[PDB]
Amino acid sequence: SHNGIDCSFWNESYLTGSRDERKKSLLSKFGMDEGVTFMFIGRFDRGQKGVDVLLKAIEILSSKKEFQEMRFIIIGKGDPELEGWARSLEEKHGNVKVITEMLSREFVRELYGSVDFVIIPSYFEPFGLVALEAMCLGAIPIASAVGGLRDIITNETGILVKAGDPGELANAILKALELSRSDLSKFRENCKKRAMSFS
Amino acid sequence: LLSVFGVLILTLLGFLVAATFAWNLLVLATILPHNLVASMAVSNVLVAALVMPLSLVHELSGRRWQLGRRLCQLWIACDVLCCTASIWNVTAIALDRYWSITRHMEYTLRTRKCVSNVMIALTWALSAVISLAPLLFGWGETYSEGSEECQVSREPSYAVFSTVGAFYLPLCVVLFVYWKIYKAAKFRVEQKEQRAALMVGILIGVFVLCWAPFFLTELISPLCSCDIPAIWKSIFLWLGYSNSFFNPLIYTAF
Ligand SMILES: NC(N)=NC(=O)N1CCc2c(F)ccc(-c3c(F)cc(F)cc3F)c2C1
Numbered sequence: 077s078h079n080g081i082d083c084s085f086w087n088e089s090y091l092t093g094s095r096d097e098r099k100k101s102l103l104s105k106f107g108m109d110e111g112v113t114f115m116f117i118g119r120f121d122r123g124q125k126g127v128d129v130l131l132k133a134i135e136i137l138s139s140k141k142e143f144q145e146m147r148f149i150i151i152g153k154g155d156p157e158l159e160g161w162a163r164s165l166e167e168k169h170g171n172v173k174v175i176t177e178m179l180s181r182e183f184v185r186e187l188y189g190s191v192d193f194v195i196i197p198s199y200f201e202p203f204g205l206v207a208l209e210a211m212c213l214g215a216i217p218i219a220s221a222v223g224g225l226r227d228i229i230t231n232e233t234g235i236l237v238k239a240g241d242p243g244e245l246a247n248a249i250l251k252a253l254e255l256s257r258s259d260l261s262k263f264r265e266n267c268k269k270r271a272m273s274f275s
Numbered sequence: 276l277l278s279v280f281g282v283l284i285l286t287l288l289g290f291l292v293a294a295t296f297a298w299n300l301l302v303l304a305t306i307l308p309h310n311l312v313a314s315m316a317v318s319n320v321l322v323a324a325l326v327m328p329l330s331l332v333h334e335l336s337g338r339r340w341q342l343g344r345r346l347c348q349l350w351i352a353c354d355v356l357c358c359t360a361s362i363w364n365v366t367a368i369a370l371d372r373y374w375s376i377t378r379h380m381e382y383t384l385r386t387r388k389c390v391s392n393v394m395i396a397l398t399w400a401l402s403a404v405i406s407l408a409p410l411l412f413g414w415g416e417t418y419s420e421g422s423e424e425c426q427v428s429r430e431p432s433y434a435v436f437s438t439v440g441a442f443y444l445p446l447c448v449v450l451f452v453y454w455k456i457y458k459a460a461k462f463r464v465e466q467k468e469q470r471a472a473l474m475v476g477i478l479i480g481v482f483v484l485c486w487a488p489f490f491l492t493e494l495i496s497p498l499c500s501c502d503i504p505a506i507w508k509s510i511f512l513w514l515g516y517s518n519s520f521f522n523p524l525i526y527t528a529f
Contacts, residue, residue, distance in 0.1 A: 077465075078464055078465070078468070080468060082465055082466075083465070083466045083467075084466070272467065274467070275465055275466040275467035
């Protein structure tokens with residue numbers, strides 16, 4: 077392999093219905109209802125994949141009115157303290173779900189195909205596979221401006237922030253929440269073209 | 276009768292010259308590694324516009340060269356220059372794809388842009404020094420005298436120089452890189468890079484297949500083939516010229 081993405085697997089055509097319908101159906105099974113959905117998927121660790129930055133950004137965002145309109149799905153496992161901190165936030169709020177089991181590719185595809193926003197707060201990323209997989213299904217990326225993530229994401233494809241800085245990430249999530257208009261559709265298709273450009 | 280078929284085929288070839296010109300011009304228009312694409316299309320536009328029409332009338336139909344003999348040299352120079360340039364543009368594109376497949380790591384946008392610009396500049400420089408070669412190196416004349424016909428200088432030194440410069444060296448480069456390119460085209464270490472590899476491999480195959488009869492029979496003539504019928508010589512020449520038309524058809528197919 078050469079770390080390309082399979083356009084014949086990560087495609088929306090495998091998915092059924094409208095994107096809003098899929099997002100509503102997915103939220104329902106977590107006791108939640110229609111909100112603006114954010115997703116992290118990766119290992120929990122200090123210094124590499126950036127779950128610590130994302131947790132701090134969430135703690136910052138928890139104090140503001142706009143927090144009522146957000147939803148957060150954290151997916152992964154690893155450093156036990158990060159897992160406990162994540163569970164703590166899951167228990168404090170009903171708009172936060174945490175999954176610590178490994179999920180199938182088909183399920184993760186269904187996730188990417190309804191979740192509408194993926195956060196990739198990495199300290200360093202070589203290839204940006206997660207960003208391409210998300211982009212190929214319409215999820216808009218919010219990643220730190222490191223590694224191949226800045227190669228992949230351009231002016232009109234996502235949001236970039238400085239790695240390791242929680243406040244900038246929380247501000248980015250606020251800007252993306254502000255970004256929630258019908259324009260999302262344009263912003264989605266840009267992603268889907270650029271991802272195909274990295275097949 | 277005899278010449279009815281000949282008129283029909285000459286009309287067809289004139290149409291072909293025009294389609295070559297137009298198709299390359301279209302590919303050039305949609306542009307303005309797209310700089311290598313532009314360089315190749317420029318060389319093929321120049322072939323169809325300068326080289327092919329004059330060969331079509333003179334060498335292929337039969338009308339004798341009553342044009343100014345001071346321009347016979349310019350037509351020969353354009354032919355040599357543009358065909359050498361087209362061959363080496365195909366091989367530069369081949370080198371670019373082989374470096375995309377094998378040298379995936381260090382071939383960042385900065386490096387790739389630098390190398391492709393160097394290759395374009397070098398392509399045209401070598402086409403110049405091969406075309407206008409017996410002038411600076413000054414060891415002969417560029418046309419074959421003693422002929423009431425406009426034919427390239429068949430002097431041995433220039434012949435070896437120009438054919439190794441235009442066909443055999445680029446042929447060796449493409450035969451070096453073709454293995455990895457074909458492997459990539461078949462997914463043997465995602466759909467976009469495979470499509471790129473397949474296009475380049477087809478371009479190389481048609482180049483080799485289009486120019487090999489002419490150069491091969493141009494090497495066996497000086498070795499007892501003192502009578503290769505010039506009808507087949509011209510067929511092989513124009514099969515080489517049709518590469519200028521097949522390259523657009525191949526590019527616009529991907
Ligand atoms: N219309 C006619 N007759 N074109 C030709 O012969 N070319 C045009 C294309 C070409 C070339 F791109 C590079 C080298 C040669 C060449 C050759 F094959 C034999 C020689 F002895 C000298 C040469 F320069 C040619 C020949």
